[PDB]
């Protein structure tokens, strides 16, 4: 199939933090990209090109460490270096909450309806019920180093977390009568696991990717614990996304090519490589229609690739 070798757009990302563990971009269901540039968050409306500086941190030294849109796209969660999880209403352009519970920077976030899960450099994961005063409703402690990857499954039955301790944990949706204990703990990656993504059409299928010392994409069945595939990408794997229409996966990489790789699922055959970034890719996010992937890189650019469409 025809995949364009050039991106559809190249947006300037001056002052983007070249820190592997941070999750600095997210594309809303309302077709708005949120991009964290140092101490500010900018919003770019894909349909009009309008840009808004939503917020800026108020104290010296503070920087944005994560962003994540709620499913409806009206609220943006913003994790900070000062261990806060802020909740912004982007229609009103105002901060609704400043949730403190963490002891260190909040580098990862994932929503499950009104529950927002936040992962910290401390190794802990907190569940926040953003609708209520006592927001901190659970603590999940299965990592000894920074939680850099965090993703609820689309059906809300599992939460996956990846850490700088080379572990992947698969958590249940509720503690039940027991405690918050992982259903699965995968130790096979030999490097940090920032890339965590669930298969949109298969409830229990998860893809994870490891850092420079690992370089592999692994596919798992979280019910059986099976590792269905382990593929060497020859570079750190910062992010993985699944196409919800083509039965393909896309991954972002660093040294030496700083490319995105498209893979055919389930064969894991390499379909294409998107080249152009001149420094390592930091994060990927996908448009709500599934057609475009935005890659944020250390070269201070956001490249938007229309790699899953012909129109």
């Amino acid at each position: 199939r025809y995949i364009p070798s050039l991106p559809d757009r190249i947006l300037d990302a001056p002052e983007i933090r070249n820190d592997y563990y941070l999750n600095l971009v997210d594309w809303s269901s309302g077709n708005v990209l949120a991009v964290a540039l140092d101490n500010s968050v900018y919003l770019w409306s894909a349909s009009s090109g309008d840009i808004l500086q939503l917020l800026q941190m108020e104290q010296p030294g503070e920087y944005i460490s994560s962003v994540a849109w709620i499913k409806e796209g009206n609220y943006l969660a913003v994790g900070t270096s000062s261990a806060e999880v802020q909740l912004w209403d982007v229609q009103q352009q105002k901060r609704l909450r400043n949730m403190t519970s963490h002891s260190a920077r909040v580098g990862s976030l994932s929503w499950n309806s009104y529950i927002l899960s936040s992962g910290s450099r401390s190794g802990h994961i907190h569940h926040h019920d953003v609708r209520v005063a006592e927001h901190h409703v659970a603590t999940l402690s299965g990592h000894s180093q920074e939680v850099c990857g965090l993703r609820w499954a689309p059906d809300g039955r599992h939460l996956a977390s990846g850490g700088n301790d080379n572990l992947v944990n698969v958590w249940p949706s509720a503690p039940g009568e027991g405690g918050w204990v992982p259903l699965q703990t995968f130790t096979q990656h030999q490097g940090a696991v920032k890339a965590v993504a669930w298969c949109p059409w298969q409830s229990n299928v998860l893809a994870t990717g490891g850092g420079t010392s690992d370089r592999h994409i692994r596919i798992w069945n979280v019910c059986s614990g099976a590792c269905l595939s382990a593929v060497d990408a020859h570079s750190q794997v910062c992010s993985i996304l699944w196409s919800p229409h083509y039965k393909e996966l896309i991954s972002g990489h660093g040294f030496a090519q700083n490319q995105l790789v498209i893979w055919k699922y389930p064969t894991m055959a390499k379909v294409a490589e998107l080249k152009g970034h001149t420094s390592r890719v930091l994060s990927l996010t996908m448009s709500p229609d599934g057609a475009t992937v935005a890659s944020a890189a250390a070269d201070e650019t956001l490249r938007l690739w229309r790699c899953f469409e012909l129109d």
Binding site: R9, I10, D12, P14, V35, S40, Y42, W44, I51, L302
Partner: peptide
């Protein structure tokens, strides 16, 4: 350098 500009 305007942020997010083309």
């Amino acid at each position: 350098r305007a942020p997010x500009s083309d």
